[PDB]
Structures are given as structure tokens and as C-alpha cells.
Amino acid sequence: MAHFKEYQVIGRRLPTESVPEPKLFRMRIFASNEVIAKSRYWYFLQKLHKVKKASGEIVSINQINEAHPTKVKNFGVWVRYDSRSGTHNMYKEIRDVSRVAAVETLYQDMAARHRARFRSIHILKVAEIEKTADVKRQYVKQFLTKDLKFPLPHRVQKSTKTFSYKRPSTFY
Amino acid sequence: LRSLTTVWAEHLSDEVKRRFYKNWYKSKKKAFTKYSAKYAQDGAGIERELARIKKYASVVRVLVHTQIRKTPLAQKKAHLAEIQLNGGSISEKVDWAREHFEKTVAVDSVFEQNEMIDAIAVTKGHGFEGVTHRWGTKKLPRKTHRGLRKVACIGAWHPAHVMWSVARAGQRGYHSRTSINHKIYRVGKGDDE
Amino acid sequence: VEPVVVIDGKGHLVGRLASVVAKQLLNGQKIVVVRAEELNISGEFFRNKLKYHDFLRKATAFNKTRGPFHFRAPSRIFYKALRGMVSHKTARGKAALERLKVFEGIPPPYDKKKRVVVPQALRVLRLKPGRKYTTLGKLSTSVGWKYEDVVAKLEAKRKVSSAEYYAKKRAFTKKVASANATAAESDVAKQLAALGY
Amino acid sequence: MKYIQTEQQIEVPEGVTVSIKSRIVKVVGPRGTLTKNLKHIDVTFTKVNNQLIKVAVHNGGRKHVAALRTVKSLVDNMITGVTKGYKYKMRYVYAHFPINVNIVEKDGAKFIEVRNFLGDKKIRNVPVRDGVTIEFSTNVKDEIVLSGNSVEDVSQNAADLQQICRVRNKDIRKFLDGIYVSHKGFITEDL
Amino acid sequence: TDSIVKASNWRLVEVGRVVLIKKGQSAGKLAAIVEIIDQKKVLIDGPKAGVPRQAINLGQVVLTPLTFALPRGARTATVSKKWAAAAVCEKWAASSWAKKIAQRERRAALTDFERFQVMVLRKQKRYTVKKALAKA
RNA sequence: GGCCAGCAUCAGUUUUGGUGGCAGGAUAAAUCCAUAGGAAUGUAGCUUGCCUCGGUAAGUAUUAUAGCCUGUG
RNA sequence: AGAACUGGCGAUGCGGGAUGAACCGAACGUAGAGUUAAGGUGCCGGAAUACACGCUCAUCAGACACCACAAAAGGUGUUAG
RNA sequence: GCAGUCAAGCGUUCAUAGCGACAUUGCUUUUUGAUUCUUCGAUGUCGGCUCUUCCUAUCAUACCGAAGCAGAAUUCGGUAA
RNA sequence: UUUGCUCCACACAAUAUAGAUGGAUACGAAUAAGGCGUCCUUGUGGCGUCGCUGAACCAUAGCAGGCUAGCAACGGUGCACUUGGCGGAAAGGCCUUGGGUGCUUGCUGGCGAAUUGCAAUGUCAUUUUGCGUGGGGAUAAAUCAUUUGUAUACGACUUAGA
Numbered sequence A: 001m002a003h004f005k006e007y008q009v010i011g012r013r014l015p016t017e018s019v020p021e022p023k024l025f026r027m028r029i030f031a032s033n034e035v036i037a038k039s040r041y042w043y044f045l046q047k048l049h050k051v052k053k054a055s056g057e058i059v060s061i062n063q064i065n066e067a068h069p070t071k072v073k074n075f076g077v078w079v080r081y082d083s084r085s086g087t088h089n090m091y092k093e094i095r096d097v098s099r100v101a102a103v104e105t106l107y108q109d110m111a112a113r114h115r116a117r118f119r120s121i122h123i124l125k126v127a128e129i130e131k132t133a134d135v136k137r138q139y140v141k142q143f144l145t146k147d148l149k150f151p152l153p154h155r156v157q158k159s160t161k162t163f164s165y166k167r168p169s170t171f172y
Numbered sequence B: 001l002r003s004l005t006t007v008w009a010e011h012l013s014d015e016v017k018r019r020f021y022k023n024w025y026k027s028k029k030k031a032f033t034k035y036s037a038k039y040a041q042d043g044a045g046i047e048r049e050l051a052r053i054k055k056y057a058s059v060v061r062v063l064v065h066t067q068i069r070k071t072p073l074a075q076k077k078a079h080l081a082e083i084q085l086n087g088g089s090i091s092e093k094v095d096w097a098r099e100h101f102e103k104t105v106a107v108d109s110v111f112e113q114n115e116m117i118d119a120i121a122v123t124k125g126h127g128f129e130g131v132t133h134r135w136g137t138k139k140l141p142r143k144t145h146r147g148l149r150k151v152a153c154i155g156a157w158h159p160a161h162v163m164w165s166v167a168r169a170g171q172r173g174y175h176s177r178t179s180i181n182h183k184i185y186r187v188g189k190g191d192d193e
Numbered sequence C: 001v002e003p004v005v006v007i008d009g010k011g012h013l014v015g016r017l018a019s020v021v022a023k024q025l026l027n028g029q030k031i032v033v034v035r036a037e038e039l040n041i042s043g044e045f046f047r048n049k050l051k052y053h054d055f056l057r058k059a060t061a062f063n064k065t066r067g068p069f070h071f072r073a074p075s076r077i078f079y080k081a082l083r084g085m086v087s088h089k090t091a092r093g094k095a096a097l098e099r100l101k102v103f104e105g106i107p108p109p110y111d112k113k114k115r116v117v118v119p120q121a122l123r124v125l126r127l128k129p130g131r132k133y134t135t136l137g138k139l140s141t142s143v144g145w146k147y148e149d150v151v152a153k154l155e156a157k158r159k160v161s162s163a164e165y166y167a168k169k170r171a172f173t174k175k176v177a178s179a180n181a182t183a184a185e186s187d188v189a190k191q192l193a194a195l196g197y
Numbered sequence D: 001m002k003y004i005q006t007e008q009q010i011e012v013p014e015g016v017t018v019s020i021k022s023r024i025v026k027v028v029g030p031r032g033t034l035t036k037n038l039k040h041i042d043v044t045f046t047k048v049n050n051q052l053i054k055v056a057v058h059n060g061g062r063k064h065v066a067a068l069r070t071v072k073s074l075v076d077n078m079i080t081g082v083t084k085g086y087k088y089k090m091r092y093v094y095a096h097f098p099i100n101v102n103i104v105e106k107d108g109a110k111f112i113e114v115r116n117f118l119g120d121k122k123i124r125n126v127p128v129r130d131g132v133t134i135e136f137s138t139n140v141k142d143e144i145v146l147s148g149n150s151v152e153d154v155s156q157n158a159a160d161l162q163q164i165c166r167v168r169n170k171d172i173r174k175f176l177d178g179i180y181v182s183h184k185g186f187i188t189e190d191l
Numbered sequence E: 001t002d003s004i005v006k007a008s009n010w011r012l013v014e015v016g017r018v019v020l021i022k023k024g025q026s027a028g029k030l031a032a033i034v035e036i037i038d039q040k041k042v043l044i045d046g047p048k049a050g051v052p053r054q055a056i057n058l059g060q061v062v063l064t065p066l067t068f069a070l071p072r073g074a075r076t077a078t079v080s081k082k083w084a085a086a087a088v089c090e091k092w093a094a095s096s097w098a099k100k101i102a103q104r105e106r107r108a109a110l111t112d113f114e115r116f117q118v119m120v121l122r123k124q125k126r127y128t129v130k131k132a133l134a135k136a
Numbered sequence F: 001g002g003c004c005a006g007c008a009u010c011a012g013u014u015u016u017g018g019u020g021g022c023a024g025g026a027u028a029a030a031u032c033c034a035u036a037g038g039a040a041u042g043u044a045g046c047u048u049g050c051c052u053c054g055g056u057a058a059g060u061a062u063u064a065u066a067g068c069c070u071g072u073g
Numbered sequence G: 001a002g003a004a005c006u007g008g009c010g011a012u013g014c015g016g017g018a019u020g021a022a023c024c025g026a027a028c029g030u031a032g033a034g035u036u037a038a039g040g041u042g043c044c045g046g047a048a049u050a051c052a053c054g055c056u057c058a059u060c061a062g063a064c065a066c067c068a069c070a071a072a073a074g075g076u077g078u079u080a081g
Numbered sequence H: 001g002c003a004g005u006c007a008a009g010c011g012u013u014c015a016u017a018g019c020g021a022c023a024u025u026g027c028u029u030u031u032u033g034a035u036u037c038u039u040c041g042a043u044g045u046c047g048g049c050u051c052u053u054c055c056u057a058u059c060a061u062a063c064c065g066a067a068g069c070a071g072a073a074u075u076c077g078g079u080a081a
Numbered sequence I: 001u002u003u004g005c006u007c008c009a010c011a012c013a014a015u016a017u018a019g020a021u022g023g024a025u026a027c028g029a030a031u032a033a034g035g036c037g038u039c040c041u042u043g044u045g046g047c048g049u050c051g052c053u054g055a056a057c058c059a060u061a062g063c064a065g066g067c068u069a070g071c072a073a074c075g076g077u078g079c080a081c082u083u084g085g086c087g088g089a090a091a092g093g094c095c096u097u098g099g100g101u102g103c104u105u106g107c108u109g110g111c112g113a114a115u116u117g118c119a120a121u122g123u124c125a126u127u128u129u130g131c132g133u134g135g136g137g138a139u140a141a142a143u144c145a146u147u148u149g150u151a152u153a154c155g156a157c158u159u160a161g162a
């Protein structure tokens, strides 16, 4: 749906005479802008409580920034999704440098592997897998082995003119 | 395959010389009369051609012609033609060729008894020919309006086009044919009662 | 850039080599292409062989002459790929095509001239390593082309002579570099360095 | 998922030097020398020490990796092939017509010439591949033996002899007639 | 009769491999690989050169043959400490790469007149080399 | 002053660059600095076992002869 | 084949969907400059052989609404759960 | 009209050699219907004769796999027009 | 048939142009590997070095490039000659020898340039042909009609005729 920011959204059931000061609920929401974020909020909220936007009020919206944006991190990701023929819970693991990058590629992955578009996906939980060896998916574990090194074989340099006078070479 | 030179013998029988023309009697008979001159100077020009052939040349064919005067035909104008030369080695081949210039080659030197040979020729002609004999289509019944040596259905309605694959009146005969496996039962000799 | 651009077909992908050759013409650039027998097509040999027979069955029912023509030669397989990318039924189209020449091997003129390449169609830069692909010459020879062996013979001959040329040249250029070096450290030489040379 | 690297070892024994440039492999030991083209496959060889060579695949999928081992093996069987060497054993099998098997030569040939198969007046022929040598076993009834340095060449020559003796138009369960491969192994013994 | 087995000797992605960035506000700038994220992303950092600590695609970077000692996941100040200490800049600078980069940047800052002087010089050199190329 | 142009200063419309000053927010989040605590894909040292005179491995071992993480300021 | 509400075609060209009454965009005096729609940008053909992460190898691969079809059932092909 | 999936049965024994109920998913357009879009200022509105070409859901012939294939004979299936 | 043909040379005249405007600047082969230098045991060899683009290399100053002088070099280069040789895939081009000759911006000099008026492609290419001039060279055929029948509806084909 684009390039996400994470937002704390807070809403609460429009006050009333017999109930001034209703209860206040928060959601963290990955959206590309605050407008979509407030929409999503109401979307899941009417999925949990008896409210809808009509009778309720957004109280506060705040972007949350990554705590350590240049720290590499192992993300455990939890998702609910709809397939063509049914709906499905699912756990993936993503390694990147911020919860916001991570959710970008999840949506990418869900779309690429399961043909899940944004409408049809639900983030259950994104959280930092602290101790390695509670990392479970191999395609991640692979990148924790000590003194990791790999070549990047068969190099393709992009030509900037149409013709070339050489014959290239993919050494690297 | 492309031809890259033709070397010619110094003298040339009127028989072949005649082939190079459509009106012999009026003509100044000038054919090959400059080429012949190429022998004069020691040999120079002819050799380098021969020489060239040897260097390149994947195949070699000899220019031969018939002695039609030794033949009861009227037609005087002899026949000339290329014959490939299979005996070994390009260089040996042209030496053979060069050697036989103006000299004369015999059948027994080419064919033996019981040998299977092929015959290449232009078929007898019959001119414009109806479908029934040209293709051996069925005669149509005797009752049929406007002719019966025909084909009833020259095609379905679609392709709305007569097609290349159906019998149609036209020329018959005077076709080229390459006929194989004719066996030599005799190689006769002229000088031989 | 240059009056004529000679392209070593070898190791290029037909429809990418085509797609650039076409544009080049339409923009006024004369082109010759060589070694079209050493041209490539993605997909294993069998796939493109099957593809080619598809092409083979198309023909004018009433008369197989009016119908689609099938050229078997590698240059000519190429030209088909190319012509289809050119509005070849317009003056402007007929014009552009005439700036084009395709050839199996490298026949005279073009063998003493330099040939270039087209990286955005070079196979080794384009195909994912691992994918099966096809050589024009072998494909053509499978559908009728009569002249693979001869081209190969003539080429090996050509490749020899050119190896002499090169060697001869690499010799001379060694001397040049030697000379070019005993002039290093001189004033003129240091001055040029200063100015980027 | 693409594995960032998986690899294998190829041991080298005391008699042989294997030498590999681009992916053209040459193995040379006591029994001679074979060579085999691996260009079609995209692995990286590395010598670690005269008795050890590694083969690895960087950032590869299943089907890729899954060819790394068959590379390790193909190159092993060259090294075993050039030390011990290979020997395939085949026995004739027939239930009435004796299968007459000879070796004949036209123009340097060497051909396995099978006659009287299930009676057949027809005379069968299988060419002897180069590298491979045929010895009709003494002391064993109807045993042919193909031996050589290439597993691939004997195994194939073997399979060519066996297949030339397929049976048609009969229940090939009752008609078991043939020349079958009955033992695969080595030339040099105690092993 | 040893065995002789090629090589194929790739520059590797590894903590402390220095790369020359190619797209973006940095670009032309060197930098060190600090941690490694996946097959296609690494965390880079290049304080000496100005380039911010960031996550980057490998696709936009080109591995150099240079490497120094860096602890995986070392922070910017630490990186600056090792870098200087391992003297990578002089090392890079000395290379043909960097020297060739420098060359063409000069070629492209030449004045028209400077350009003119370049030719007068090449003429000068040509005269004496062409000679020597004719006396042995 | 007939024809067609070039440049300059402006007017209407528009397009494409450079650059200056400010406002928000966790009065951005980081880096950095300070400080407390920690752990391993465990840095020094140490022990032990082979091993061409140290190099390896498998133990201890939380800053030492690398560093990192986490909170607070 | 027959009704309901609206919007259309009929009566209407223009851009897009190769093509096409009705779909998409947009409704028309004669023109300049700009900007867009729907739809596109390898070449045909104006416009990135752009960027980015995955997936897919088909000895009948696939390739954009209306639209020019495919189903049950299976695969130790491969992907992620 | 033709071809499937499930597999209860059939096949002495034995679901699937060869078959296959109750169900059920399809394909075809030489059947017949349903429609009424084109032709009513006219598209010669049975069949046969002739003659071409094309499809394949293959009767024969080439080479194969399978069988409740001993041989002979047959049946099932593949590549095949 | 009114002195015609051809090749080289120049000259006038036309006619064009799918588009000159410093240079199409030659190994091959591999790409999970190469190029170049060097050594040696000449090999799937040792060692060194390069790539990360042709953004290069070469050429490039002078009335669109005039007229002149000199020096240092003995190099470069244009042109017509001559020596030996190689190239047949479409070779029709490449290399080499030797004198002659022009130029040289390798360096240092004398003279010139304006008024094309503040820009106007400001005209420098190469296509094909036509007409005289004189320097080499060469002196046919086909067709109709006639005729044959190995051919033929007519044309066409195949023969024949000083």
C-alpha cells in the first residue's frame, strides 16, 4: 500500500452525559499516511468494540520512530490472511533494520508468495526476537553464523551506451 | 558453390564453336579468337588460371562436347557440358584436364558391362493436354453437358480459390527427368563389325 | 556515432539484438551484423526447434508460394526477428532496412574492420546463469540450412589469420609502451600528467 | 531459499593429480587419465591440499545444490576409475538357444557379435567403446566382462550389449533370454 | 605433479570490506560494511567520507579489494577509529582504481586553453617517442 | 515604411534549475557524549588435548591486548 | 424471451480497449501555449531495455477489466505456511 | 455423441488386467431441439457421380509400454493422420 | 543509318542525394572467469599487474588554414613511382623495398588577414548522365523473313542457310 510509517492511534467512544470520559483504546498502525492510518484504526476497532467513526472520536495520532534505526534486527512477524478459498494465520521472520522496513517487505512477500494484496492481510504482532536461537526460520538463521562471508559471483555491470567495444566480464 | 574460372583449350572444333552462335553462316566466327591468343606468350596467362584453380576449387568439372558430325543427325550444332571429375586430388584433377585439352575421351573409359547407370533427359513433348490424359483423371459419364474429359469438382467452396493440388489442363511432356538404375547390357565399339 | 556499426552477433539474444538494431536504423544508423550463426535464443534447443516448425506449417493453402516464406539461414532468421520490428511496408521502413546487412561469419571488408557489441542483448549479461539457451547455427542446420560446415571451415581459417594479425600487433604495441616509458619522467611527460594525461 | 553456501570434498589418493581450469577436469593416475567437462554447471573448485579438493555453490537453489553432489561424485568416479578402475560383469541367459557371443573387427572395429539369440538367424552387433576392453571369462559359463577406466564407458557399453538382446512379441516374463549385467565393481583386487 | 586448481577469487561481503557507493547523495564515497542483513542488503558506514550510517542494497555499491579489521556491528565512532588506524584511505588512494578516477575528474575540469596546452604537449611527446620507436 | 529576422528591456501565460529565512514533531528518532546494567555469533588472559617450535580446536572467562546490546541523562 | 431504477446507444464525433453501436476517459465553434484522463513507455510506437522485493522454466509456459472460456480430480516440480 | 474423478461392486481368489453402480466434473458441434441475428427487388432450398484438401476421438500399416501376455490369437494403453 | 565503341586523363555542362562535416580504431576464447607483462620445466605452470567501462585511443593550432626564413632532428606524413610478398567467403584489399617529391605545429622568426559591417549552412560532399577536344586499345552480333520437327493453340522451342 506503500512506504509505511508506524502510528500510535488513540480513539474513544464519543462522550455522553451518563458516561463522560469513556475508556480510550490504542492501536499501533502501519500506514503510508495519517489519513489511511485513522481509517485502519476504525477498521479494526469496529472489529473489536461496539463503535464506529460516526459515534466515536480520534483522540491522538503520533508517528512512532524506530528506536535504533541502524541496528540490524531479527523480526518475528505474525499475520492473519485471506486466500482465495479460506483464511489463515501465519508466522514469518524478517531481518532488517526497523519495524517499518520489515512491514514493507512482509506485504511484499505476502503478495509475492500467496498473492495476498493489502486489503486481505492483518498484522497480528511484530516484535523483536531478542535472543538468537529463538529465531526459527532457516532463511534467517543462515545469516547469524559467525564470521559470515560470501562472494557475489557473476557481476553484471549496466552499460550506459548502447554499443560496447570490449566484451564484458563478470569477475568480482 | 560458385564458379571462379573456366580454362579453355587453345583450338576449338567448329562443332563447339558453332554452339556459341544463333546464325553461324553470316557470323564472323570470331569466338575464342582472342582467348586462343593467350597461349602465344610462353603460356603465362593460362597457367596462372590453372594454377589458381588448384589453389582453391573444392570441385572440378571438365568441359566436353559431342562430335555430332559422327552422327547421322542433321543438326551440326554440337552439345557442350560440364562433367564433374571424381578421380583423386584437385591438383591431379586439373593436370588430367589440362592434359586432355583438344584430346578425346572414350565411353569404355567411363562405363563397364553390367554397370548400373542413370539417364538424365528431356521427355517427349505432347503440347497442350487435357486433364484426363495429363493426370489420368477418370473420364466423366457419357451423359454430361459440355464435355467429359474434365474434372467435375475443381474445388470446394472454401478456400474460395482453385488450389495448386488439383488436376488442370496444360502442357505435357518435355519435362526433365532423372531416371535411375538402367543396366549396361553392352558397350559397343564403333570400329567393330 | 560512426558511419557503419559492425556487430559480432555471437553471444547476443535474437530479439534483443533485433530490438536495438531496428531502432538504430529508424534513427539513421547504418548497421551490419556478423556471425549470426553464433547468435543465441533463450530456451532449450528443442523448444525453439518446435517453435520453428510451428512457423513451418503456415502457408497459403491454395498456393504455398504466395504464402509465408521460411528462410532457414541464421542471418535470415535474424532478419525476420528484425523486419517484424520495423514498419517494413512503408517508404520509411523500406528505407531503414536498407541500412541493414546481416551475415553468417565475417566476410571481407568486415573482417579487418572492428566489431562492437550490444551489452543490453549480450547473453552472458542478460540470461540468469542456469537457464537453457540455443545457438542459431544449430537451430538452422536442423531446419534445412545447408552451410554450417562451410561457414565453420572458413571461420577457423579466418580465425587463424586474425591470430597472426593480433600477435604481430601485440608485439608492436609492446615496443610502443617501451618507448612510451623511456619518455616518462621527462618534463613534457610530467606536464601532461598534471593535465590528466 | 537459496543457500548462501554448501560444499563438498573430493579426496585425492597418493597416485593421482587432478587439475582443473575453468571447469575442465583432468584426473591422471596409475591406470592412465580421464577428463570431463563440467562447464555446464556453475560450481567453484578449490584445492586445499594435494589430497583434498573442495567444490562449492554460492547463493544457490535446490536444483543447483542438488547438482553439487553429483559433481562431487562424477569427479570421484574419475579418481577411483584411474586408480582401481572399473569392471562390469554380464552373464548370458537363455532357456533353449545357446547365445553365441564373439568379438569381430572390420576396419579396426572391435564389435560384440551376438548370434543365435532365441534362435534368431539375425546377427547382432554392439561396438566396443574406446577405453573399454572385453574378456570372455575363462572358468565361467557364459560370462562376458567389460573393463576400463571410465565407469561411464563400461557401464554404457554394458547396457548396449544388454539392450541389443531385448525380446519382442513374447511374454518377456517367461522368455527371460538375454545378456544381463550381473556384477559391478573394480579391476584392482583386495578392493 | 601437484594438482593445480584455479582459484576464482571474489571480493566478499564481510564486516570491514570497504565499498565505493555509486548512487545517491554519497556516490563516489567509500564506506565499510558493518553488519550484513541478507543476501541483498548490508548495513554500511563511512564516517571519514561523510556518508551516514545506513542500510543499503548491494546493488548500489561496488565491492573493492580493500578490507580491514572491524568488529561485526561496530558503531560509527568505532568505525572511524579502526579505519584511520588501518589507513584505508591512503591504501585506496594508491590504487589504480582511485588514481583512474582522479584522472578523469581532472580531464573533465580542464579549461579550453588547458585543453589546448594538452595538445601542444602531446605533439611534443609524440615527436620524440616516434623517433625512439625507430632506433631499436 | 513592404518582407524576414537578431538582440535588449518589460507584460501575460507557462515550464525547468540554483539558493536564503523560518514552523512543527518523542520541541523528530538516531550518531555523539556521560553513566549504570547486561549478554554472546565470547575480545584479552587462562586451563586442557592433539599438533614441524605456535596455530588450531573446547573449556572457563563479561573488557582485559576488540567490541556490542539495553535503560537513563 | 420478459419486467424494476438509473446511466447510455439510437441521435455522437474525440482519446483509450489492435479491431468493434452500447465498456473506460471525456461530450465537439476557429486556433496558440500549457496540463492531464482512461490507457501506455523493448521494437513496431510518442514515453525508463527505470528502480525495488519475491515467484515462475512448461518436448503445446504466460502475459491485464467488459473480452472473446475451461472444470472435477491429481503431482515426491518448486515456493512459503 | 465422446472423455473423466470417487470407488461400492464385477472379475474363482483379487476394487482399479479388463470392467464399474450410486454420484459427480467436463468436452464436442456430422444429432435433434431452443432462438430468430443475417438473407424474402431470390445466396439453386435431396442423393449420387467426380475431385481436391483438412481434422483425429487411429480401422490398417511403423516402433513401443501393459495384460487374468505359455505358444498362437486377442485385448488395454503411448508416439503417430 | 553520316565517325560509331571502349579504358585513362579535363573540360564544360546538366541531374541527383533516406542525409560526409576529425578517424567504422580487425585476435580468439571464457564469464562459477579473463587480458597484459614477465620468468621458466613450455604447463589446465610460477610470479606481477589490470578491470569497476570508449568519459578511451589516435588525430586536432596555421586565408576551410595564405606567402616566407631558419634550427634541431633523420623522425612523421601526403603523393605519384619502383622491389618482394600475402589475401578467392563477396579476395578487388593488406604488407614490404628503394630512391623522388610536398608538408611538418619538434623549436625559433618576417609578412598577411579589417568593410562578409552584431547572426543568417554562408556553399569546401558524392550520384548518375550528356557533349565536344586527344593519350592508350578493340573491329561483333541478335532479330525479321526463309527453313527443320527431337517443338508448337498463337508466341515460344529446336535445326538449317555466303
Ligand SMILES: O[C@H]1[C@H]2c3cc4c(cc3CN3CCC(=C[C@@H]1O)[C@H]23)OCO4
Binding pocket: H039, H042, H043, H044, H045
Ligand atoms: O436465397 C434464399 C434461399 C433460396 C431461395 C430460393 C431458392 C433457393 C434458395 C437457396 N438457399 C440457400 C441459402 C439461401 C438464402 C436465401 O434465403 C437460398 O429457390 C427459390 O427461392
Ligand SMILES: [Mg+2]
Binding pocket: A064, A065, A066, A067
Ligand atoms: Mg518503538
Ligand SMILES: [Mg+2]
Binding pocket: B004, B005
Ligand atoms: Mg577471375
Ligand SMILES: [Mg+2]
Binding pocket: none
Ligand atoms: Mg485426345
Ligand SMILES: [Mg+2]
Binding pocket: B136, B137
Ligand atoms: Mg489412368
Ligand SMILES: [Mg+2]
Binding pocket: none
Ligand atoms: Mg501412361
Ligand SMILES: [Mg+2]
Binding pocket: B143, B144, B145
Ligand atoms: Mg444432358
Ligand SMILES: [Mg+2]
Binding pocket: B137, B138, B139, B140, B150, B151, B152, H050
Ligand atoms: Mg475426373
Ligand SMILES: [Mg+2]
Binding pocket: D169, D170
Ligand atoms: Mg507384448
Ligand SMILES: [Mg+2]
Binding pocket: D169, D170
Ligand atoms: Mg503372443
Ligand SMILES: [Mg+2]
Binding pocket: F004, F005
Ligand atoms: Mg519575422
Ligand SMILES: [Mg+2]
Binding pocket: none
Ligand atoms: Mg516573462
Ligand SMILES: [Mg+2]
Binding pocket: none
Ligand atoms: Mg527551502
Ligand SMILES: [Mg+2]
Binding pocket: E069, E070, E071, F066
Ligand atoms: Mg575485532
Ligand SMILES: [Mg+2]
Binding pocket: G007, G008
Ligand atoms: Mg453505464
Ligand SMILES: [Mg+2]
Binding pocket: none
Ligand atoms: Mg431510427
